[PDB]
Paper text:
MCR enzymatically reduces methyl-coenzyme M (CH3–S–CoM) to CH4, with coenzyme B (CoB–SH) as the electron donor for the concomitant formation of CoMS–SCoB heterodisulfide. McrC, a small subunit encoded in the mcr operon, co-purifies with the methanogenic marker proteins Mmp7, Mmp17, Mmp3 and the A2 component.
One map harbours the full activation complex, including the A2 component (58% of particles) at a resolution of 2.5 Å, whereas the second map represents an assembly lacking the A2 subunit (42% of particles), refined to a resolution of 2.7 Å. For the ‘as isolated’ sample, mass photometry confirmed an assembly of 502 kDa and defined peaks of smaller size, indicating partial disruption when extensively diluted (0.03 µM protein). When compared to the structure without the A2 component, no significant differences were found in the active site or wedging loop of McrC. However, in the absence of A2, the N-terminal helix of McrA became completely diffusive. Altogether, this unique ATPase may not only stabilize the opening latch of McrA but also facilitates ATP-dependent collective motions in the activation complex subunits.
Author numbering:
A (entry chain A): 2 to 260
B (entry chain D), D (entry chain E): 2 to 443
C (entry chain C): 4 to 553
E (entry chain F): 94 to 277
């Protein structure tokens, strides 16, 4: 068949982007945050109650016979009619292990039935609540995709992806949802992602050391690794741009001879 | 005749219908079914008789939240629906045997009127149907219930909302699939002003049929806008054939191959099929081992990518059973495909930009709304020439009820009236039939 | 290393611009800013006096503002700093007058009127009669009523900004006319520019009417043309006394105020329903011609950057952040293009690279030069963002960064080739290269037109093709999103600054906005915005004489 | 048949052609000639090759006084003309037995292109003609002269001109008789866009033929606007027959009877003919004499008054040999008739109101333009439903060159293009023949 | 020359009425948020600060001078007497107090048990810009106040639902647009 190559380039950042894009690549496990702690950090529901429902379970409701719709297996949260909630992150520009477009591409190539959006300041995923919690805890939190110092889960007032880190190597946060504790070195979350305070702070673990961050980040930087050091990615980008321009002008094989 | 490439034809269930069909057989300029659909969409008008009765009984004329005390008429339109329909048919009939029909819908609660084509031959545009039906309704209501001469104004305001003052039928009880010509955002955009919800409700939430309806409308519009002439015609012909009628069973094949898959798996399937069919070849191998691809057939590659985009939307929004993933899927299918192959996206990035704006205005405060309120005439989704709306229709068909602005909320009268015609309800099979009819003429 | 933006970063930030760490949450919140404290004191006084206790401004709700250091803003090529609140278009009278002066301008040609007067109407037309007509229209345009005391007239002090001016490409007629109300092309433009403009204009005469600002304040932009036409007709039938019939007067009226009318903007269709002379109808070439820096500067980068500043202040702030969205607005995005010398530094590097490699205009527009120039400029800009953490803090939003880098790339390409569509193609390549570099771009829907752009830059389809000079806010791709249009106008100007052109799209607009009688001087838009941010700009349209003092 | 009305058809010389012709034989919904004229108007486009060459040579792209330095293309469009025409026809061609006429005008400086009807059967409006022609012209110009990839935008601006930004064709060199549907006064107003000067130039300043052209266009438009539906259809059919097509020879008879007369004498002859034909009777005689008159046939009286209005305009403007009298003639014809008989005027005062519009539009400093640029698609002239415009055509045909807006100044290209069609040059004769061909089907 | 006529036109121009019932239904059935009169009071407090041009989210904003927007009000009225009882009278347009008994009853019967918000954007906004600015200004500020008063995500599908409701579904304009020839 066809063996995918995900991204171009031979630098370390290109390899990390390929690993994030690759669904057969096992993300390294770094933390162990229990499901209740993650659920209470998201702040959508209290751990212990039943899932709220936005529409009756798919078995109860009746649908028209659609052959091309019923041959795609739905998520477990979809057949239970669970409501669609979100998890949102801000990734620092200083060697955060995951980056907005990288996160969106990896999520869309790894998860089923998710809605991913990317900005400069934040990246958000929306899915059914049960599936969202499951994949969030299993992939987004206790893997290399999350750094408690350079990445924080923020639902509103996202600001600090481009600001300088503070004296603890920690991202700026206006609401101060997560706090660095000096007497242990651990980072503790004192509020939910929206900003509502928690009853008890939840420990998310130690921050990743900077040296490790350098070799697992997916961002090109003049100090870490420059895009000038990966000419293949630039060449591919220029080829895509030229192909777009030629197709916009006249979409024929003769025009594409000047590719 | 001028295009040597043939296509196969598969139904909505993936069964073969015919092979070696010329590409031009599905062309809007040749296919009889597409011509019939365009002719019938211009002359069919939906009438809300119950809405008229309710508006007149409470004096609810004037649009949103507006009442005129004293201008209240107590009529029984729904009970006398047969008489009203007979009078409207008599008024609109041209000679004796024209295609004038006024069928009763929902026990007289709605009317589906079709003005004769003879009334549209001598008309420059399509607005004659709505105005003629409005006048016929006014006369029928005035003559059935002996309405006073000083209340014909109230009747007119009940049928059309504020038309002389507002160049539209906003508060009225008369509707059509196409919008008013004053709402067009560009020249030739008349056929692009059909919202996604209207297309989904017309096809009764059938995914493949909704895709076919939306694609046929969008590509016929591109023909009308002058975009699909000259060297741009083959690209749109292939886009309609592959993304919209699953010519080589590409859409069903990709969905079947990715029943429990993600968007990336659909991208991989699309690239594998394109390589197997010879559409794309390896241009060069880079230093890092990246295999840059080039299209051996540019338009065929575009068609393959569009079919894969429809399949990816179907897979993702069927896994989620929610129609809010459409914009993300359309964006990231193209985004992953381009940097996996080095090839341009579905519409040379024009579908990606439409998906970006769709994501923006479907997730922010600046406008837009649910995916069902967008159309090809919308300022946000007008940018891709018929390659982005059929996926939106498929996704809204796959929805399980997580959207408030669902087809039921938005298109109740239009959907119920236009679902009664087999050509509008199942466009896919009738377009295939027309292509089969004109198969041997090329 | 020496950078043009270094001095502003030194002034704005207390730490070293290369320093990667700082401290937060120690500034006292909104109290750290004098503007916010003034706003609080005002809000208290207004609430108590005028609002009868209904709250207006409550900083204690919502985000706690000022958790970080609220930076001041320089203005490019100007040595004066201001807070970000002073640059809001509602708080800045200079930006409001910038839009007012463009809104209230209509140019009408008077050669068909003269020919109809001479031949059909049998009335002689001489420079003395032209001077008499100019006197009449100058009295009558603001609010006047000629020799009719019984007619209601507008208070003269209410329309002190209303003028009627004349200019012509005919030299002898120009020097025979009164200099009180003449826009002299010869003494306002350099010799070669004046010759080019006179050749483009011809031997024709044009009158410029500046409707008073108050008229546009009370009404909309479509009022300006009607006001101008009515006053022109009255003045024409009052100055020249004619004994012909009324039908000949109708022909003369068409010739005089419905024949050679030039408007600033066109009407918009659909959901953008608007009349003429609204900022969404102004094409990029027209805005380039409005700005007059080609008159007083030979530097192409400065000429492009003044148009960038004006286009940002108009399109991003007024048009998009008020006419189309409203609320606090999109001031951020626009100030990013003209506050510090960041875009100046990037554009100067792009010009230097083009001059060293291809020459000032030494290459024909090909794909290869577009790709290499755009890639080089984008890489330089992104590494500048990388190695100066204070710079990244200054341009905190991804959009403001993307727009600046892409504008530098497009200006560089336009310098190299002299083609505006090549420049916009370079802009789009820069945008996608930026996205791949930083794994980031602007907001959610910032790159709708940047993914659609490459294909639409050189397209020939009906709704996709247009020269960048003929594009504008109503171009379908550019209709909605912020952070593009002002830079597009700058790129369109840079296409012609490379060739040393006297104008970009319309000579008449250039000459008309060279007028010294305008309140906002378009020779230095950045300086005037700086003056307005300091509350030292004298704007028009104030109803001080018809309001109580208490 | 549903109308028992019969008419006798007379040619432009006052000779009898046929008798007892059914009134619906001249209906827009039945008459073949009116159908053919509507189709030809929809599908015909005029191209100014000399204008394109001049605009490109000087870089004069833009609306008015606009010119882009550096974007100048030096091509010989007029010199070749035929390679361009052949390429445009080849691009626009749909089939072999296909209309697609592209014809050379004025020795190469103009093109008269007729888009095939196949491209208009699948279009919701008429705008496909200009867009398709513009695209074909752009492709032909880019292919014939090897235009660089970076100048196609310049070519587009020269052909269409500001279109994406400014939603029309302002500075372009391509034109059609119908304007953009987004720029209409109301719904269905597309056909009331041809000015009086265009009608006069097309018919070569023939009074009866220009009257027939204007009346046919106006009444077909009323049929399109929904106005001529039901009870109003008879009034508009009679108006067309008696005001445009000289039915019963009323217009010629009134003109002959008032060769040396005034408007008052025309009113007298109209009333005498109406009395003699049984159209009006005596209502009652008041105390001070003045026998009041009531119409025994309301629609026929309106038609007689309309024919008399045309005759009065002809008489007054042939006495003065100037076309500036139309407004006053219509206004005071209606006034004198009303206060002479106690009867309503033409169109129940709408003709008089439109005449007031004409007066204040062409007779003051707040006037604008002259009578030659009158059309029904204006805010000032829209109020009469095809009863006030056709007489202006007679007025402008009678003008002896004393108007600034003469047909030669404003409609030279229009006359050169549309005078080639027989149904446009002599609308009266061919409409009469078409009505004769369908006499027996009623 | 008459500031009263200018203010008449300004007050008519700057008024937009928004029906805040569909938004409440979205908050209740999609976001699972409970709407009570206390939450409505908090929302009114928020929007009276946000509509003139104050900042609620997105750290580091600039704000318009309160002196230029002293005429900017966000008012609420309802035909539901029970809900109107426990509403902050500062932001309430009381139908009972402003209208005689019979007229108040007629108005309540016509309006029904529905809640509406009246936004009066500053006159300076309509004077700098045109009249088409008002609805968009009100819609943006309404969306911002909604997402900051109920502690929601700053941007999701429900945000689009709010935006669409406040932009056209539940909005009442003083004057309709005039596209085409009229061009306004
Ligand atoms: C709530 C929204 C959704 C939306 O439609 N607009 C918001 C908010 C809105 C409000 C701010 C209301 C207030 O002051 O509280 C306004 C002013 C629009 C308006 N007229 O109401 C605005 N943004 Ni936004 N907005 C901006 C920006 C940005 C950048 C911030 C970069 C970052 O640090 O993360 C990001 C986009 C991103 O995804 O990257 C952004 C997002 C967002 N922006 C997100 C989420 C905000 C969050 O922090 O929770 N703005 C900027 O990049 C600077 C310019 C700035 C605009 C105002 C100005 O020019 O001063 C402002 C423009
Ligand atoms: C898309 C459309 O919104 P609607 O859904 O039609 O209301 C359109 N808005 C805009 O253009 C918003 C532009 C300004 C805010 C976004 C700048 S990034 C408009 O108001 O007509
Ligand atoms: O972030 S959003 O794209 O919602 C708008 C930015 S102001």
């Amino acid at each position: 068949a066809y063996t995918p190559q995900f991204y171009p380039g031979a630098t370390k950042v290109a390899e990390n982007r390929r690993n994030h894009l690759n669904p057969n690549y096992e993300l390294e496990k770094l933390r162990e945050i229990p499901d209740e702690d993650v659920v209470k950090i998201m702040g959508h529901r209290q751990p212990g109650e039943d899932y709220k429902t936005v529409h009756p379970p798919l078995e109860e409701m009746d649908f028209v016979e659609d052959y091309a719709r019923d041959l795609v297996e739905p998520l477990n949260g979809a057949k239970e009619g669970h409501r669609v909630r979100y998890i949102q992150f801000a990734d620092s520009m200083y060697f955060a292990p995951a980056q907005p477009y990288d996160r969106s591409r990896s999520y869309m190539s790894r998860l089923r039935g998710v809605d991913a959006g990317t900005l400069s300041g934040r990246q958000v995923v929306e899915c059914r609540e049960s599936d969202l919690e499951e994949f969030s805890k299993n992939i987004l939190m206790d893997t290399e995709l999350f750094d408690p110092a350079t990445s924080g889960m923020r639902g509103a007032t996202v600001h600090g992806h481009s600001l300088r880190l503070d004296e603890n190597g920690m991202m700026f946060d206006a609401l101060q949802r997560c706090v660095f504790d000096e007497k242990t070195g651990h980072v503790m979350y004192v509020k939910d992602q929206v900003g509502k305070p928690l009853d008890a702070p939840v420990d998310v673990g130690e921050p990743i050391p900077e040296a490790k961050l350098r070799e697992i980040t997916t961002i090109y930087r003049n100090d870490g690794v420059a895009m000038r050091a990966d000419p293949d990615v630039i060449e591919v980008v220029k080829r895509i741009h030229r192909a777009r321009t030629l197709g916009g002008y006249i979409p024929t094989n003769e025009t594409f001879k000047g590719l | 005749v001028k295009y040597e490439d043939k296509i196969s034809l598969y139904d909505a269930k993936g069964n073969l219908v015919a092979e070696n069909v010329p590409l031009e057989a599905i062309s809007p300029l040749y296919n009889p079914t597409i011509k019939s659909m365009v002719k019938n969409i211009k002359r069919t008008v939906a009438v809300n008789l119950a809405g008229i009765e309710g508006t007149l009984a409470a004096g609810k004329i004037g649009g949103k939240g507006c009442q005129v005390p004293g201008r209240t008429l107590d009529i029984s339109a729904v009970s006398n629906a047969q008489a009203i329909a007979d009078e409207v048919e008599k008024i609109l009939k041209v000679s004796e045997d024209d295609d004038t029909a006024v069928k009763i819908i929902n026990g007289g609660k709605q009317l589906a009127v079709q003005v004769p084509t003879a009334r549209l031959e001598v008309a420059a545009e399509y607005s004659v149907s709505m105005l003629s039906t409005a006048m016929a309704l006014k006369e029928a209501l005035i003559k059935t219930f002996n309405i006073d001469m000083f209340d014909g104004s109230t009747v007119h305001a009940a049928i059309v909302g504020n038309y002389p003052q507002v160049m539209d039928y906003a508060g009225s009880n008369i509707a059509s699939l196409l919008g008013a010509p004053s709402m067009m955002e560009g020249l030739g955009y008349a056929l692009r002003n059909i919202p996604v919800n209207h297309a989904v409700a017309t096809t009764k939430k059938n995914m493949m049929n909704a895709i076919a309806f939306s694609s046929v409308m969008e590509q016929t519009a591109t023909f009308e806008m002058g975009d699909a002439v000259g060297s741009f015609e083959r690209q749109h012909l292939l886009g309609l054939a592959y993304q919209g009628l699953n010519a080589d069973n590409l859409v069903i094949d990709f969905i079947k191959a990715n029943a429990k898959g993600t968007v990336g798996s659909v991208v991989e399937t699309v690239i594998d099929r394109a390589i197997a069919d010879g559409v794309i070849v390896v241009d060069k191998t880079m230093s890092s081992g990246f295999n840059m691809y080039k299209p051996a057939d540019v338009n065929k590659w575009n068609a393959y990518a569009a079919a894969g985009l429809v399949a990816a939307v179907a897979v993702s929004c069927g896994a989620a059973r929610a129609a809010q993933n459409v914009a993300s899927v359309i964006l990231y299918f193209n985004d992953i495909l381009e940097y996996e192959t080095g090839l341009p996206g579905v519409d040379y990035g024009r579908s990606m930009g439409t998906a970006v704006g769709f994501s923006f205005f479907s997730h922010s405060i600046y406008g837009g709304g649910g995916p069902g309120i967008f159309n090809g005439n919308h300022v946000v989704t007008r940018h891709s020439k018929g390659f982005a709306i059929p996926p939106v229709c498929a996704a809204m068909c796959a929805d399980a009820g997580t959207q408030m602005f669902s087809p039921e909320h938005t298109s109740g009268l239009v959907g119920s009236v236009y679902s009664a015609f087999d050509e509008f309800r199942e466009p896919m099979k009738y377009v295939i039939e027309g292509a089969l009819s004109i198969k041997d003429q090329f | 290393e020496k950078r043009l933006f270094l001095k502003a970063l030194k002034e704005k930030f207390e730490e070293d611009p290369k320093e990667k760490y700082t401290k937060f949450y120690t500034f006292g919140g909104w109290e750290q800013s004098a503007r916010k404290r003034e706003f609080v004191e005002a809000n208290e006084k207004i609430v108590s006096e005028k609002r009868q206790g209904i709250p207006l401004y409550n900083p204690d709700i919502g985000v706690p503002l000022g958790q970080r250091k609220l930076m001041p803003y320089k203005l490019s090529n100007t040595d004066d700093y201001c807070e970000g609140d002073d640059l809001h278009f509602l708080n800045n009278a200079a930006i409001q007058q910038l839009w007012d002066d463009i809104r209230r301008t209509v140019i009408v040609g008077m050669d068909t009127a003269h020919s109809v007067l001479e031949k059909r109407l049998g009335v002689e037309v001489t420079p003395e009669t032209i001077n008499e007509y100019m006197h009449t229209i100058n009295h009558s345009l603001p609010g006047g009523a000629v020799v009719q005391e019984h007619m209601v007239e507008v208070h003269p002090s209410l329309a002190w900004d209303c003028y009627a001016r004349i200019f012509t490409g005919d030299d002898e007629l120009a020097d025979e006319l009164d200099s009180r109300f003449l826009i002299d092309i010869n003494k306002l433009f350099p010799e070669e520019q004046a010759e080019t403009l006179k050749a483009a204009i011809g031997k024709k005469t044009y009158q410029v009417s500046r409707v008073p600002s108050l008229v546009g304040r009370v009404c909309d932009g479509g009022t300006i043309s009607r006001w101008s036409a009515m006053q022109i007709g009255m003045s024409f039938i009052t100055a020249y006394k004619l004994c012909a019939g009324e039908a000949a007067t109708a022909d003369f009226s068409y010739a005089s105020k419905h024949a050679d009318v030039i408007q600033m903007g066109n009407a918009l269709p659909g959901r953008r329903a608007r009349g003429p002379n609204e900022p969404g109808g102004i094409r990029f070439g027209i805005l380039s011609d409005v700005v007059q820096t080609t008159r007083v500067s030979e530097d192409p980068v400065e000429q492009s950057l003044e148009v960038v500043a004006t286009g940002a202040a108009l399109y991003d702030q007024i048009w998009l952040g008020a006419y189309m969205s409203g609320g606090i607005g999109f001031t951020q995005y626009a100030t990013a293009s003209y506050t510090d010398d960041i875009l100046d530094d990037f554009s100067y590097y792009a010009l230097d690279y083009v001059e060293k490699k291809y020459g000032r205009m030494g290459t024909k527009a090909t794909m290869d030069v577009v790709e290499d120039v755009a890639g080089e400029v984008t890489l330089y800009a992104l590494e500048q963002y990388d190695d100066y953490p204070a710079l990244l803090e200054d341009h905190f939003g991804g959009s403001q960064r993307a727009a600046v880098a892409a504008a530098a790339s497009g200006i560089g390409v336009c310098m190299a080739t002299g083609n505006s569509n090549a420049g916009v193609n370079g802009w789009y390549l820069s945008q996608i290269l930026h996205k791949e570099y930083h794994s980031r771009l602007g907001f959610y829907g910032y790159d709708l037109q940047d993914q659609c752009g490459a294909s639409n830059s050189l397209a020939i389809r009906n709704d996709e093709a247009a020269p960048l000079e003929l594009r504008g806010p109503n171009y379908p791709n550019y209709a909605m999103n912020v952070g593009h249009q002002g830079e597009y106008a700058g790129i369109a100007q840079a296409a012609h600054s490379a060739r040393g052109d006297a104008f970009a799209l319309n000579p008449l607009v250039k000459v008309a906005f060279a007028d010294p009688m305008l309140v906002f001087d378009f020779s230095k838009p950045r300086k005037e915005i700086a003056r307005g941010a300091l509350r030292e700009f004298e704007a028009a349209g104030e109803r001080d004489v018809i309001l109580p003092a208490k």
